[PDB]
């Protein structure tokens, strides 16, 4: 028939083909050329120290057993052909759980050119590990990696390369940014050798540089803490004799600053060190407690009844020391 010509080409290609053996198993090294098209950089989970990334992982390699001569130079075939030829066993070193999509058909590609050059594209959703150091939180930047390489074939068997220049071999789409908390500054690739128990392997690294935005935490943490400190210092402008009024400033500011301290350190996972936000909370929590101690000292010295020199000193000393702390802290951590 009209389509039997390609049928006999495929049946001649697969006749006597051993897919258990890589091309040049005993003669040379199977070089595999790789590039990544990031269709969407998904959300970064702070709690699990991971990130999600959607790709068009492409691999290309030379196989001399898939040479053909026909009327068509490139055989654009489906996914069923890729299970009958040798394909490299590329896995992600720092992945946790990634899905190769197969709706509605398996999201794969296979194009066999006439010189034997192959191309094998896949749709993946990699949940890789991003080890984080939350010491400058929330004003911190990250270098979340994506390391991939072969699983069974060592450095002497299968090597990996980038098919274009390394600056252009990982492309992120323009609409593809599902980051809401961070922003993507750029990509960074590298190639190296990893040593393991079984042998030495070629590993290819892609570093995605992230930077957190503080907009949320300057509305759900920093500004309520500043307003709690300010409202704890408006109790210095009152009457000395109003004991329950200044008492209820002291207790309500201490309780709400405690509640803010609980509903802040809880956002992220449980780390042993202290973030910059915890230092801001601790200094604020010291300021409000000092205001309470100031009222307690004034009330131990009340008995007409003159205003207090402690109140007149604390009307000036407390806000200027809070401003000095803010101008130190923000200039230290933003720079």
């Amino acid at each position: 028939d009209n389509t039997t010509v390609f049928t006999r080409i495929l049946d001649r290609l697969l006749d006597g083909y051993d897919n258990r053996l890589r091309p040049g198993l005993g003669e040379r090294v199977t070089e595999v050329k790789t590039d990544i098209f990031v269709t969407s950089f998904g959300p970064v989970s702070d709690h699990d120290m991971e990130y999600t990334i959607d790709v068009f992982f492409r691999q290309s390699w030379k196989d001399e057993r898939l040479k053909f001569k026909g009327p068509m130079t490139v055989l654009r075939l489906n996914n069923l052909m890729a299970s009958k030829i040798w394909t490299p066993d590329t896995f992600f070193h720092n992945g946790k759980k990634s899905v190769a999509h197969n709706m509605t058909m398996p999201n794969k590609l296979l194009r066999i050119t006439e010189d034997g050059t192959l191309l094998y594209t896949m749709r993946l959703t990699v949940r890789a590990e991003c080890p984080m150091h939350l010491e400058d939180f929330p004003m911190d930047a990250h270098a979340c990696p994506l390391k991939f390489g072969s699983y069974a074939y060592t450095r002497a068997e299968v090597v990996y390369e980038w098919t274009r220049e390394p600056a252009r071999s990982v492309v992120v789409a323009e609409d593809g940014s599902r980051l809401n908390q961070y922003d993507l500054l750029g990509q960074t690739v590298d190639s190296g050798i990893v040593q393991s128990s079984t042998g030495e392997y070629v590993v290819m690294t892609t570093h995605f540089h992230l930077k957190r935005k503080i907009g949320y935490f300057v509305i759900q943490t920093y500004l309520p803490c500043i307003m709690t400190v300010i409202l704890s210092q408006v109790s210095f402008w009152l009457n000395r004799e109003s004991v329950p009024a200044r008492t209820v400033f002291g207790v309500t500011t201490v309780l709400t600053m405690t509640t803010l301290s609980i509903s802040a350190r809880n956002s992220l996972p449980k780390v042993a060190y202290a973030t910059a936000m915890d230092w801001f909370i601790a200094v604020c929590y010291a300021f409000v407690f000092s205001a309470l101690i100031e009222f307690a000292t004034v009330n131990y010295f009340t008995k007409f009844n003159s205003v207090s020199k402690i109140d007149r000193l604390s009307r000036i000393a407390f806000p200027l020391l809070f401003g000095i702390f803010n101008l130190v802290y923000w200039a230290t951590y933003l720079n």
Epitope: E161, E165, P166, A167, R168, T188, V189, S191
Partner: antibody, heavy 116, light 105 residues
Framework: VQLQQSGAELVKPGASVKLSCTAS????????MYWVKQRPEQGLEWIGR????????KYDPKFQGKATITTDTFSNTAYLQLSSLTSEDTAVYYC???????????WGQGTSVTVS | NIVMTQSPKSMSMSVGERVTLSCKAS??????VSWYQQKPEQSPKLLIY???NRYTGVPDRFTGSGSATDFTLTIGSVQAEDLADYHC????????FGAGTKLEL
């Protein structure tokens, strides 16, 4: 395993010169072909890139327009087209094969052009 | 573009001691430098690819090193036949080259 280039050229300024180098022992469809400029008593300067399997070319922005790179499949040969030759174009040209981990593996013997 | 700023221009020492080079990058090039020698009236030959990889035909006295931005090439007991010019390049992006480090007696 051997990249043989053309001979030395001496033409008047403002003309055009055809320059070429032939790769033997392999095929140029696998690896990229790089062109480089070496001024005397100076450092190397990159001219352009060509992918013979794809036909894509990429050039130095300071060398855009005045130089372009072509190729053919049957002769396994990389070609240069130089236009509007001046006094600063007196240099020796090598064609470099892309190698392991993007390294400029093989090099030609060198073609020196001179204007007058 | 990426700018290679290898230093110095030339070093004039004897035969049989340790001499090192340096190559500093303007932007990131990650283990993608390449070192070549340049004899007078001779084409460049490859010595080191990647960051520290010894090419075939290179003696064990030529040891390279690399990092994210700072690169170096250390020579152990340089001989009389190694008196040539050394070049540092990059290929993480479209390739650029440095000026060149020479050797003298």
């Amino acid at each position: 395993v051997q990249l043989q280039q053309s001979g030395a050229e001496l033409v008047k300024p403002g003309a055009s010169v055809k320059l070429s180098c032939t790769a033997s022992g392999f095929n140029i469809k696998d690896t990229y072909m790089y062109w480089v400029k070496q001024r005397p008593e100076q450092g190397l300067e990159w001219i352009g890139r060509i992918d013979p399997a794809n036909g894509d070319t990429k050039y130095d922005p300071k060398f855009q327009g005045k130089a372009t790179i072509t190729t053919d499949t049957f002769s396994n040969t990389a070609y240069l087209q130089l236009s509007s030759l001046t006094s600063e174009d007196t240099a020796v040209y090598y064609c470099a094969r892309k190698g392991l981990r993007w390294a400029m593996d093989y090099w030609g013997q060198g073609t020196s052009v001179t204007v007058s | 573009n990426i700018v290679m700023t290898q230093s110095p221009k030339s070093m004039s020492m004897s035969v049989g001691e340790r001499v090192t080079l340096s190559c500093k990058a303007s932007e990131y090039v990650g283990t993608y430098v390449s070192w070549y020698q340049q004899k007078p009236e001779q084409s460049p030959k490859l010595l080191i690819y990647g960051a520290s990889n010894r090419y075939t035909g290179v003696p064990d006295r030529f040891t390279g090193s690399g990092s994210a931005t700072d690169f170096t090439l250390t020579i152990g007991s340089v001989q009389a036949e190694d008196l040539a010019d050394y070049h540092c390049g990059q290929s993480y992006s479209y390739p650029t080259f440095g000026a060149g480090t020479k050797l003298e007696l």
